[PDB]
Ligand SMILES: Cc1cc2nc3c(=O)[nH]c(=O)nc-3n(C[C@H](O)[C@H](O)[C@H](O)COP(=O)(O)OP(=O)(O)OC[C@H]3O[C@@H](n4cnc5c(N)ncnc54)[C@H](O)[C@@H]3O)c2cc1C
């Protein structure tokens with residue numbers, strides 16, 4: 001990467017905000033996944049949207065790849081600079097603007113995390129529900145199409161993103177639903193917002209997100225329920241959803257995951273396949289949701305609810321850190337699967353996955369947003385064991401195809417990145433692939449917008 005080009009970058013954002021140092025680049029060449037670190041040629045921190053546009057234009061017209069970088073908590077190698085180029089760390093734009101409490105909406109820049117937004121919303125009676133376990137950039141969550149434990153009731157990022165400000169690859173500024181606009185529904189033209197949610201930085205750079213806010217629940221109750229088998233826990237989940245109990249959270253941990261979270265946190269739950277549950281409503285509706293949910297779990301051998309305030313906070317902090325609890329079993333890197341299937345097929349595939357984990361030499365922990373028909377298998381890797389690494393690939397790839405055989409999807413929330421590109425081709429077929437690629441080509445003709453990812 002030439003000296004003239006570095007100086008041009010410095011002319012846009014300022015000398016302290018451009019780095020070609022090896023250590024700085026290596027810190028931006030990987031996320032939380034096992035994908036090998038591939039350092040960008042430079043890291044740049046733009047200070048405002050005009051600078052983002054000018055950096056993109058400079059890179060695009062010089063043939064230099066662009067890698068958007070949020071908080072680096074992705075798990076599919078999205079930020080890995082597989083073709084080098086300029087990593088654009090967006091987190092110095094960290095302002096919350098256009099807070100509209102009366103319309104339930106807010107605008108956030110990429111440096112704002114969910115924790116920052118909800119802390120600033122304290123005493124407002126509103127909150128933002130989509131809750132990945134990591135302290136992630138909200139614009140990064142828009143880019144990956146993230147969900148979370150609350151999504152079963154309050155929706156995913158796709159459900160809660162109202163508008164996006166996007167710097168297109170050549171530097172043009174797009175407001176996907178129109179500058180400053182926010183509303184509950186629209187039929188005006190083609191919905192551009194949904195195209196950029198889940199685009200993983202391959203269609204442009206999200207520089208602000210307009211988010212739907214939600215009213216805080218009147219009352220909240222959380223509990224855990226232990227089961228004799230995976231089958232019993234997942235049958236309960238499916239029957240709770242089919243009875244239309246509006247649970248706020250319903251999370252599955254197998255016995256391995258439960259034990260790992262016990263060891264990594266303040267919990268001392270029975271080591272067994274377990275559901276973490278949370279209910280929102282008034283006192284009347286809570287008692288009614290509880291009684292219907294306990295009846296279903298009892299029918300499948302579930303324990304009486306272990307109730308949980310500080311202890312719901314420790315409960316959900318343990319769940320949110322399950323990824324790190326799993327890593328701490330083999331102090332190793334990990335790969336995560338992320339399939340999502342029609343809910344009636346969830347018992348088949350979860351039980352089958354548990355049986356396959358045991359039948360193989362591999363270690364795995366299972367945790368899942370099962371209210372969405374979604375779960376993750378966390379598979380540890382010795383970073384220096386090449387034989388283990390292909391067995392992990394082979395396992396994750398066979399699980400993905402089993403989900404596809406059931407009518408599901410290879411990723412419910414994490415995205416495709418580097419790891420699921422072949423599975424995506426099988427999921428949507430040749431006309432789906434060509435259509436997606438035609439969309440990529442019109443927004444990024446030169447193929448410089450995070451190349452090598454998704455497609
Ligand atoms: C402990 C843990 C728990 C997690 N739990 C969940 C969970 O429950 N649900 C879930 O969905 N994910 C979860 N994740 C994954 C991850 O946190 C999410 O995918 C999150 O949305 C990534 O955001 P980020 O800014 O950290 O992404 P990064 O890793 O910085 O980037 C991810 C991808 O998005 C692109 N990108 C980032 N920011 C932008 C932007 N502003 N504009 C355009 N493209 C951009 C990058 O180029 C890359 O391709 C978890 C991760 C960890 C470590």
Ligand SMILES: CC(C)[C@@H](O)C(=O)O
Nearest residue numbers: 075133322323336376
């Ligand atoms: C599996 C990890 C990465 C996240 O998706 C979670 O559900 O906690």
